[PDB]
Each structure stands twice: as structure tokens, then as C-alpha cells.
Design a protein around this ligand. Structure first.
Ligand SMILES: CC(=O)Nc1cc(Oc2ccc3c(c2)CCN3C(=O)Nc2ccc(CN3CCN(C)CC3)c(C(F)(F)F)c2)ncn1
Length: 274
């Protein structure tokens, strides 16, 4: 075919390393065509360009090329390094990293108003993803990124804490992923936000199932627990109205879950009613 993007836009010889960010692997770089200046960018690298992994990475790039929204990570381009025999993905750099880390490291600047702002922004990014007919699958605060104290953006690191504790029951039992299972996972993200102050979904589910359990037995008990209305508890200090949004997202009846449009409106109305 051809190159997936303009092979001259980010020339490898001008892409300068600044810092390791996560390990695929992500790095901070400066693109300095041209004097020790230029834009700072985030750069994703693939560990092993097998037929399958490179296929997957191309699909990821094609997805990102199609997405432009204030609450979705911003694609910038690709870099064909090693003499154009390797591919790297170039993104906007977001200084505060993952929302999971930010909630732990910057509790001093987080209150319930900010949590609801982030909640709203996540719902709106997810509305947009649904118009593009994408299913996220991996919605979790580890995959949401923080630009500043007033703005978060959905992503998917894809560098690899089990993801099963965010999955809807029909995803666990039938591998059925849908907008509605993204809504279930969103309910877990909302729980994460309000626990930010031993509270994580894995730790809380493991306490309910039995902390000594290992292996597939954990999966068996998680499925059975969820099918019969076992749920994460209301976080300390969480308003009843916000826990009710969580519980409505965690409906085993797929079609009774709210939409992302319903959720953005409800959350913004609660914020506006203060
Ligand atoms: C400090 C610090 O670390 N700062 C950083 C770090 C950082 O690292 C990142 C973060 C995210 C991402 C990358 C690098 C490279 C790719 N990437 C990313 O989110 N890709 C992505 C892939 C698929 C999908 C959507 N698909 C739809 C289909 N699904 C099945 C999967 C998801 C999406 C989404 F969800 F639409 F935004 C995003 N980026 C900026 N600043």
C-alpha cells in the first residue's frame, strides 16, 4: 500500500529522548527540526513487531487517526525510525499522566466538584467514541489521562491490576463487549474516582470473594457474585445519588443500563444544581 502517515512529518533524527513514561513502551520526546526547542510529544513503541503485533498497532493508529475530541487523547502522527523499518506513534504530551496516578499524587487539589467534572468529561469522550462505532473495552482510570486540573482525556495505554474487575458479567461469561459493557466499566471508573482517598476494585472484590483464593477460582467466584447482585460498596463520603449512578450502570440487564448521553446530562445537572 503506502505509509500509514506522512513519513517526513516526524523524522527520527530530530526526535530527541527526554524521559521514559511507561513500560509496548511510552517515552517523552522533543521534536526539534530546527535549536533545542520544538514541541514535546509522547511516543509509543512496540516491543515485538510480529505479524500480529504490527497488525494490531496499525489498527490502533487507524483508530486514533479517526478521533478528534476534547476528551480523547490527541494523535499527532507516526515516525518511521530504523531507516523506515520500524514504526512509532506520536501523541500529544499530557503532563499529569494517568488519572489513577493523579488521584493518588494530587489529592490536595481534588474535591467532589472536580471528580464530577472529570466524570462528565469521560462520559462525553465516550459519547464521541460511540458515534465512531468503537467499543473501548478497557475503560479504567489507569487509561484516562490528565492534561491539567480541569481536563482529562480518554485513552488506552495498550502496554500490556487484572482488567477482569472492570468487565460486565456478559463480557466475562460470553466475551460480549458493547457500548453497554463500556457503561458497566464506566460505573467502575466512577467508583474509582470516589475511592481516591485497599479500596481499589481488585482489592474490594478479592475481599468479598475471599483473599486466599488463587487462579481461575477467582474468576468463577467473581462471575457468580456479579450474577446474583454482589457489588462494590458505596465509598466513604460518596453521596447516595452518585452511588445510585454506579448501581444503575451495574445492571445485569444489558438493555436497562443508561446511555452515555443520559449519564453526561445527569452528571452535569447534579453539578449545575449546586
Ligand atoms: C506523564 C505521561 O505519562 N504523559 C502521557 C503519556 C501518554 O502515553 C500514552 C497514552 C495513550 C496512548 C499512547 C501513549 C499511545 C496510544 N495511546 C492510546 O490511548 N491509544 C488508543 C487506542 C485505542 C483507542 C480506542 N480503542 C477502540 C477499540 N478498543 C477495542 C480499544 C480502544 C483509544 C481511545 F480510547 F479512543 F482514546 C486510544 N500520552 C500522553 N501523555
Amino acid at each position: 500500500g503506502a505509509f500509514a502517515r506522512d513519513p517526513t512529518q516526524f523524522e527520527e533524527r530530530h526526535l530527541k529522548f527526554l524521559q521514559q513514561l511507561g513500560k509496548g513502551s511510552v517515552e517523552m520526546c522533543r521534536y526539534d527540526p530546527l535549536d533545542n526547542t520544538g514541541e514535546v510529544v509522547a511516543v509509543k513503541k512496540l516491543q515485538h513487531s510480529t505479524e500480529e503485533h504490527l497488525r494490531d498497532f496499525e489498527r490502533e493508529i487507524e483508530i486514533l487517526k479517526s478521533l478528534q475530541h476534547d476528551n480523547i487523547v490527541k494523535y499527532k502522527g507516526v515516525c518511521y525510525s530504523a531507516g523506515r523499518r520500524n514504526l512509532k506513534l506520536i501523541m500529544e504530551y499530557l503532563p499529569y499522566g494517568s488519572l489513577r496516578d493523579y488521584l493518588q499524587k494530587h489529592k490536595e487539589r481534588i474535591d467532589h466538584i472536580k471528580l464530577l467534572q472529570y466524570t462528565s468529561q469521560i462520559c462525553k469522550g465516550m459519547e464521541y467514541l460511540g458515534t465512531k462505532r468503537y467499543i473501548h473495552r478497557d475503560l479504567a482510570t489507569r487509561n484516562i489521562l490528565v492534561e491539567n486540573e480541569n481536563r482529562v482525556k480518554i485513552g488506552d495505554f495498550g502496554l500490556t491490576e487484572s482488567p477482569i474487575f472492570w468487565y460486565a458479567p456478559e463480557s466475562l461469561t460470553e466475551s460480549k463487549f458493547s457500548v453497554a459493557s463500556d457503561v458497566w466499566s464506566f460505573g467502575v471508573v466512577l467508583y474509582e474516582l470516589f475511592t481516591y482517598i485497599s479500596k481499589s476494585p481488585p482489592a474490594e472484590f478479592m475481599r468479598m470473594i475471599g483473599n486466599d483464593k488463587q487462579g481461575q477460582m477467582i474468576v468463577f467466584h467473581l462471575i457468580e457474585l456479579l450474577k446474583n447482585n454482589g457489588r462494590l460498596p458505596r465509598p466513604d463520603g460518596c453521596p447516595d445519588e452518585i452511588y445510585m449512578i454506579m448501581t444503575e450502570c451495574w445492571n445485569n440487564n444489558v438493555n436497562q443500563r443508561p446511555s452515555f448521553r443520559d449519564l453526561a446530562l445527569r452528571v452535569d445537572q447534579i453539578r449545575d444544581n449546586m
